Amino acid sequence: SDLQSRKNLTEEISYGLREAEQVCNKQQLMVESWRDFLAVNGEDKEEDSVSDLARFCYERQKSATLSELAVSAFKDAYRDVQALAYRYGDQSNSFLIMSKAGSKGNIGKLVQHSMCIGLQNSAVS
Amino acid sequence: TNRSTVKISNVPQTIVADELLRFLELHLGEDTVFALEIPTTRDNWKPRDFARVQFTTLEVKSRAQLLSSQSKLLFKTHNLRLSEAYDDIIPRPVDPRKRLDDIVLTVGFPESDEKRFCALEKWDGVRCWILTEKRRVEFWVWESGDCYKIEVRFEDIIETLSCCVNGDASEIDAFLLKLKYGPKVFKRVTRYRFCKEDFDFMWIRTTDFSGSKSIGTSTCFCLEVHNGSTMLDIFSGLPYYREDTLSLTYVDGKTFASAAQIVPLLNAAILGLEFPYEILFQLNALVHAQKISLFAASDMELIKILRGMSLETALVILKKLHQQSSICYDPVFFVKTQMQSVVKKASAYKRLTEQNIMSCQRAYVTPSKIYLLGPELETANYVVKNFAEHVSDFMRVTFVEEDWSKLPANALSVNSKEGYFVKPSRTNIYNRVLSILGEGITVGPKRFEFLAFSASQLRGNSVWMFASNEKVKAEDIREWMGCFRKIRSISKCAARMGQLFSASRQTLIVRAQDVEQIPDIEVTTDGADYCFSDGIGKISLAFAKQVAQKCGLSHVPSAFQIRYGGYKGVIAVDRSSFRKLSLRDSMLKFDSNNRMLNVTRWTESMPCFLNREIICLLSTLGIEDAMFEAMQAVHLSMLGNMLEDRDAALNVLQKLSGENSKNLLVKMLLQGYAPSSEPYLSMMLRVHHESQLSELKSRCRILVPKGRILIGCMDEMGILEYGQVYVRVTIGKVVVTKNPCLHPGDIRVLDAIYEVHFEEKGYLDCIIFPQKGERPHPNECSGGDLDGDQFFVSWDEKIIPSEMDPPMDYAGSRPRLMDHDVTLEEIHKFFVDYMISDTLGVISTAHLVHADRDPEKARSQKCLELANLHSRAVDFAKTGAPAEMPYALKPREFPDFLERFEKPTYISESVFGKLYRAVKSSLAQRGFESFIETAKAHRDMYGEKLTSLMIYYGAANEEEILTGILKTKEMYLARDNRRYGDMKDRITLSVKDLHKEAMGWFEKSCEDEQQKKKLASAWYYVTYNPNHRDEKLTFLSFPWIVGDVLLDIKAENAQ
Ligand SMILES: [Mg+2]
């Protein structure tokens, strides 16, 4: 719209891209070295696994055997982010006409135009 | 009036709460919105379609609804349909005169004088909130930066007065609110909200914070509002407002301030050490009840006159203080007349070892104080019977709510998200219960330690406690009971430690030279283990005939449950026997060092009843609603004809429990008396007419004449394979089921056979099961073991369920064997872990209301998950696995059977709906001169002794202590039937003890049989003729204590 609706969309994208990171951070605790953390018992080093945010991003780069569940988790947490293109914008938008009819493109080629591009992963670098 | 929360229908999703309020404050007035809240499906970035808003007053809501009714409230091209929804997001009263903002609050115990009450501490300004819709009064107390909430509901308020502080003529400055139980102390522990105050708090429960336990000793709240004379009309909503002008005098009472955690205790620290414990126990019990104030309990002259006078003449002054209903303000006035009236007008230990009548001490622990009651008659236990000297050392400690209810899962271990996964955060009440389980209650010159708890005391949490004296301690009696170091799992060890605490009697000590081993018989197949021999023993006939005469039965018991030290199970009786104690392999529980012969149930036949799960399970096997209504009709005709006729009164009384061929009211009707001629049996049968109707409107309780309640048994030889038992009633098509049935698979129909050889064995109400072939009958029928339990049979031609089904896997999970031994700390952490995450009646309640609401009963995908979870919810005492009652299974509505006013009661249409509507249309239909002096001296001695049972428990007129059923229930007894079943037991034991004392008085009053027959005529004349009506009440129980010889007058006057 004219005013504050773009600001609401920006403040919602900035909060939906910070929850899809904590979703992917939860999936990296499914490693067999973390079997003592997922038990029903009190721990002392539990604050070191929730405060380190750069370390969990650094672990996603190297050792590409847990980075296949850190892409599929973002691709499942981004389905609730791509669904914001129906609450925002009128039904007479020329992109939602060509996306719902399946002529050229889809809903993935609209959120990169409007809200955010998403994730970027390559084969090998 | 009702509320102020108004739910908006559909606000647009691209709108924050700082934009909708700018529109709501445009059509309406300025700053008229208290708080607005929009629910989010995600955490902070996905709002839903609707939203909630709470206005300031009622006229703004009535204007906003009239504006929304004409479709004139258009916001962002979206109409708003304002509707009512009872949510109450902020519990605040919508009234400018009921919202106090500054009021001084003090606490303290009630007055020992007329108008001079003391105070412990005083808060400098609280926020008093008087709610009307939710019957509670809040108190917001600020202290050291923390916010505390004191909630006083309208049920504990018993009196409301107005006080005077300044001293002018007829001025209104303060108010005095009386309490009897105590409040609940909360604690405020920490884009779409507009709460314009301090908010986003979490009101979780906590312990006492007022210094060192200054709240639980008060039970009285004083409010001093500066206005006073204007808000006298809004205080009429408070219950029992006294129209009186009370004075006030501030007295400092800091001597009574204690420092321990158990309050209010009688501070007998300056009185010395030469004080009896039995006086201090009653003086502590009379303080928790609102009878004696705290300054009168610590007076020097009353303790001086109590100690300068003998003990048997001291207990009679303390037991008579319960006769006064109101608060007795003059403490010496009730003693100076009692000490002059006692001079004109042994059994403590003689009733423990002979007829098992003990005088135990009970106690209730509220989250803010403690509540002691006094001595009460109860069935003695074997663990108490050997220690006849330490009967004043045993003590039952219950842990209940401040309103004496069950502790919910909201006070202990409140849920809070921390990191990725949630974890239960423990509160202060949990650490208080753990601390009082570690240390114990220290009252008088002694303390108390943890002893044990049985498997029937986890539900309805209670703790047996011992004083740990210098002779025996809390560990010496447990070492005498056996050894519990071998069991490493704490859940099984906690059940094995208290298995000797059941009600049982000892007959004869059996040594260890008469023990013969018996091997186990397995019928296991396809990897699933079964046991045909599960706690089955064999006994000799001579010692069985000995223990039958020792216990006091007519015939020999064919099967009876026994506890030979650590053993537990039932014993079968054969003919060719040579030993007494012959236990099987599945009988060891711990090291059986103790040698006893404790029995709990003999061989007797009760008539078969019905359960609501039985009627709910038989209605989905191919049986319609055909014979249930006919059986209920022929039940209701006999229950409506028993109040008028005599044979109809004798038919149902001989079929119901409590009149097993020997009763007081049965032999009265044996002569042929009219049920309405005398005013005693009429009022005796008046409550018996409505007892079965109350059991028909709450439970089902359908009388089934075909069948007999019988105990399980097993034959050692084995001839029958997949056959039923030849029963003995004082055939075929029998249906065998136990009580905890939820699956549709454990229905079992058998066929009885006539055997020409079983008449020599003598099996009387004992079902025989096969012990070979495939899976056995009772182990696949609701998981019932082969021990002593109940069984329901019917050789009737009414139901006959001809639809069997193989049940699911009844195997449990792996036992949680600990690595180290049990060091007495993992037992308390398991006992407090039973108050939370324990849904036993909840699963059965949610399963019973789910079959009537959905088609294909007990076969859908939702009805099977509850039946699977019920196998784990009942096995908490064996394996430590929680029930974990999930969401999306409660139907959020209840039918018209239980009648809970919280959920909306929909109109039911099922087998139980026509079963309830048929009964519900039938409630609106309906020595003649030588014994005068002895009877005149015994009638008052019976009457004033019967008042001590009358007004101690809350009987109505005469029948609530005679028959044991209560007419008017209480708050803590209308929903807890498990405690009511033990209350009606100890009422009947007390009136039976009074009848035994009257029979003992009868033996010291007659020497001739003609005098024994003529005493009943005079004892009938004193209480039946209207010329001897005194000022007090004349109870209709005087010719029933000697009622055996009273029937001979009517048998002699006929001839
Ligand atoms: Mg059993």
Curated annotation (Swiss-Prot), chain B:
Sorted UniProt keywords: Magnesium, Metal-binding, Nucleotidyltransferase, Nucleus, RNA-binding, RNA-directed RNA polymerase, RNA-mediated gene silencing, Transferase
Functional description taken from the UniProt entry: RNA-dependent direct polymerase involved in the production of small interfering RNAs (siRNAs). Binds to single-stranded RNA (ssRNA); engages ssRNAs longer than 7 nucleotides and initiates internal to their 3' ends. Able to transcribe the RNA of an RNA/DNA hybrid, the transcript produced by Pol IV, if its 3' end is accessible, to generate double-stranded small interfering RNAs (dsRNAs) precursor essential for establishing and maintaining DNA methylation.
Record-stated family: Belongs to the RdRP family.
Superkingdom, natural source: Eukaryota
Matches recorded under InterPro entries: RNA-dep_RNA_pol_euk-typ
Residues noted as binding Mg(2+) in the record, renumbered to the chain: 785, 787, 789
GO CC list: nucleolus; nucleoplasm; nucleus
Stored Pfam families: PH_RDR2, RdRP
UniProt keyword Amino-acid biosynthesis, yes or no: no
PANTHER family assigned: RNA-DEPENDENT RNA POLYMERASE, RNA-DEPENDENT RNA POLYMERASE 2
Nucleotidyltransferase in keyword set: yes
Subunit structure: Interacts with NRPD1 and SHH1. Associates with Pol IV complex, forming an interpolymerase channel bridging their active sites, through which the Pol IV-generated transcript is handed over to the RDR2 active site after being backtracked, where it is used as the template for double-stranded RNA (dsRNA) synthesis. Interacts with JMJ24.
Enzyme class: transferase
Subcellular location: Nucleus, Nucleoplasm; Nucleus, Nucleolus; Nucleus
Remarks, miscellaneous: RDR2 is non-functional in the absence of associated Pol IV.
EC id: 2.7.7.48
GO molecular function: DNA/RNA hybrid binding; metal ion binding; RNA-directed RNA polymerase activity; single-stranded RNA binding
Designated gene of the protein: RDR2
Catalytic activity, as annotated: RNA(n) + a ribonucleoside 5'-triphosphate = RNA(n+1) + diphosphate
Lineage: Eukaryota, Viridiplantae, Streptophyta, Embryophyta, Tracheophyta
One GO biological process term: siRNA transcription
Protein name as it appears in the record: RNA-dependent RNA polymerase 2
Disruption phenotype: Late flowering and absence of siRNAs derived from FWA tandem repeat regions. Loss of de novo methylation. Increased expression of retrotransposon-derived solo long terminal repeat (solo LTR) and SDC due to their derepression; levels are even higher in the double mutant rdr2-1 jmj24-1.
